[PDB]
Amino acid sequence: AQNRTIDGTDNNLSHNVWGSTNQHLDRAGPAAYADGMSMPAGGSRPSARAVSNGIAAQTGSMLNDRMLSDWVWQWGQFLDHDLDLTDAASPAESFPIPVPMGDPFFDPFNTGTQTIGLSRSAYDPATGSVDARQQMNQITSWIDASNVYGSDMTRANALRTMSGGRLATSAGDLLPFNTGGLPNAGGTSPSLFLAGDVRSNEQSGLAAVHTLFVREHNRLADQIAAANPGMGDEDIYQQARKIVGAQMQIITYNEFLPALLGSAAPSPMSIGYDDSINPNIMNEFANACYRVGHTMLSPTILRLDNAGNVIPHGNLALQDAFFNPNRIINEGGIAPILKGLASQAMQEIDNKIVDDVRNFLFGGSGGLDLASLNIQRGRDHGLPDYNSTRVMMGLTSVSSFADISSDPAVQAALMSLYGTVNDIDLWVGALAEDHLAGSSVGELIAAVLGEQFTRLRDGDRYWYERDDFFVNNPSLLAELQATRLSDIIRRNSDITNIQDNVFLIPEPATLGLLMFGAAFLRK
Ligand code: HEM
Ligand SMILES: [Ca+2]
Ligand SMILES: [Ca+2]
Ligand SMILES: [Mg+2]
């Protein structure tokens, strides 16, 4: 059958570049650069770090109220790494975040001169001088498992064995090592994993789900070859790839979005192929509204055995999970994490980000604040303010801080940071909204996510329901439709006791009762 390109071209048969690598991020409406060119938006607002301090600071654990597991954010990130990537422009354009004088984490010597580093995002070089700067998406916009296969044929080929349609692995059926020194977040070291997306080593949970899908690909490839001998490597590879790409769509629209968006989730079925849809990820989605992962993040990733015990090498502190393959290689493999993610409730969706990523220090000595980066990134990308974005999406504009949040502490923080509802950073406003009834997000986030996911459903010629391969093999289409993330976890690991919907935490008594007779209580 027809197969997707690796680069996302030739999906839309008129604008063939649409959805492909290196396309512009779309915009919902006009950019808000101060000068209409490249000068950052939000130049009247406080420091991104002052905003982080004033509204994202979290002193205690705050569980979500909809029973959602850590799988919601882990899938969210994995799927993000299928949708969009924008690295730094080169030559580097520095746009540092001023640290408030006396900031207890980043300026404890009261210098008044500390910054958090940020280089401005890559953009189309034909933009940003005489017209608005348009940032580039460096992976395929399509939900096509480019996070497994790569977004260029060179990397895609590097990931393959070229025998039996398979993807390379390392010892213990783990991701292959980057021995060829291809581009990779964390650098070109051969001791880092190589996956379809360059960010796979970012943290161990991400790496674990990347590994899972390499396992699933190889299972499919082996079984296809077994059932259909005489088929060549290329044919087996493309068939397994097409099944895995369909799985990404099915899990995303049937499990993840219903979990996160709830009442606001878009239909999991396409209304039909609309080739007029721009599938290029929207800047305001990629670089604000879909960055709702950071507020969900838990301080620890649980690592559990089949009895629900913490494994001997302990749970994994989020900070210990960054750019370190050994957490998987030497501390129990992927199975404990896959189970663990299903077994803990994520943090609430709100302005608050855990200290583990808001105040990640490397040694005073500098470090990482994901809240500050997100805020500055939205100013780098010329994103419209929160309220303008509401109007861009056909929502009413707010006219008071009470219109944003019914929490008086959130109201007060927004007031004392911004002074007017019309100059709030999109990411901050979006996360400040009261949640829709039956949802874990507010109206703006619902609308922006709803829009993006509607486009990628109806705008993709290889949306799985209309791929000739699945149309011509209805039994496979049906088996795909009945496939959940838990099924993939189970058949590619040694996990025996996991709930069928890994996006929802299990009944409170589950771990205790499974532990009975085998409980390890010293962890
Ligand atoms: C441990 C978990 C996570 C880590 C460590 C992490 C880290 C990062 C970092 C460092 C960036 C770049 C920040 C910047 O300089 O602008 C980023 C970007 C992003 N993150 Fe997160 N993130 C996590 C979870 C999530 C989740 C759960 C989601 C979505 C549900 C998400 C969505 C995004 C998106 C959309 C971007 C922009 C991606 C691009 O287009 O380049 N992240 N993440
Ligand atoms: Ca993709
Ligand atoms: Ca939170
Ligand atoms: Mg070949």
DSSP string, 15-73: STTTTSTTPBPB-SS----TTSSSSPS-TTS--HHHHIIIIIB--S--B-SS-BBTHHH
SS3 for 389? helix
Neighbour count for residue 408 (Cβ, 10 Å)? 10
SS3 for 508? coil
Q: What's the gap in Å between 377 CA and the centre of ligand 4?
A: 40
Q: Which atom of ligand 1 is nearest to the CA of 118?
A: 15
CB of 291 sitting under 6 A from ligand 1: yes
Solved with: X-ray
* Percent of the chain that is helix, strand, coil (3-state, to 5): 40, 10, 55
DSSP track, 427-488: HHHHHHSPPPTTSSS-HHHHHHHHHHHHHHHHS-TT-GGG-HHHHS-HHHHHHHHT--HHHH
| CA of residue 509 relative to chain centroid, distance | 31
Indicate which residue of 81, 210, 381, 435 is catalytic. Answer: 81
Neighbour count for residue 180 (Cβ, 10 Å)? 12
Which has the closest alpha carbon to 238: 108, 98, 144? 144
Q: Residue with structure tokens 């700067």?
A: 133
Q: Is 435 a catalytic residue?
A: no
Give the C-alpha distances (Å, rounded to integers) separating 149 from 4, 6, 213, 445, 491: 11, 8, 10, 29, 20
Neighbour count for residue 317 (Cβ, 10 Å)? 12
How far apart are alpha carbons 31 and 42 in whole angstroms? 11
**Cα atoms in the 13 Å half-sphere on the side-chain side of 86:** 27
Domain ranges of the chain: 48-515
Type of residue at 434: D
Tell which phi-psi region holds residue 450, choosing left (phi > 0), alpha (psi between -120 and 50) or beta: alpha
Question: What number does CATH give the domain 48-515?
Answer: 1.10.640.10
Q: What's the gap in Å between 150 CA and the centre of ligand 2?
A: 8
Whether omega before 91 lies within 30 degrees of 0, making that bond cis, reads: yes
CB of 320 sitting under 6 A from ligand 1: no
Neighbour count for residue 491 (Cβ, 10 Å)? 12
How far apart are alpha carbons 423 and 215 in whole angstroms? 47
**Cα atoms in the 13 Å half-sphere on the side-chain side of 395:** 22
Tell which phi-psi region holds residue 403, choosing left (phi > 0), alpha (psi between -120 and 50) or beta: alpha
CB of 373 sitting under 6 A from ligand 1: yes
Q: Residue with structure tokens 């670089």?
A: 287
Which secondary structure element, helix H or strand E, spans residue 116, and what is its range? strand 115-116
Which tokens belong to 203? 């943290």
Type of residue at 390: R
SS3 for 210? helix
How far apart are alpha carbons 364 and 109 in whole angstroms? 7
DSSP track, 307-322: TSPBPTT--EEGGGGB
Q: Residue with structure tokens 């090592």?
A: 177
Q: Residue with structure tokens 């219109």?
A: 403
Query: Do β-strands 97-98 and 360-361 pair in parallel, antiparallel, or remain unpaired?
Result: unpaired
In this structure, are residues 192 and 178 in contact, taking their beta carbons and an 8 Å threshold?
Answer: yes
Q: Residue-wise over 493-516: b if at least 16 C-beta within 10 A, else e?
A: bebebbeebbbbbbeeeebeebbe
Type of residue at 421: V
Given resolution (angstroms)? 1.7
Which has the closest alpha carbon to 357: 302, 320, 311, 409? 320
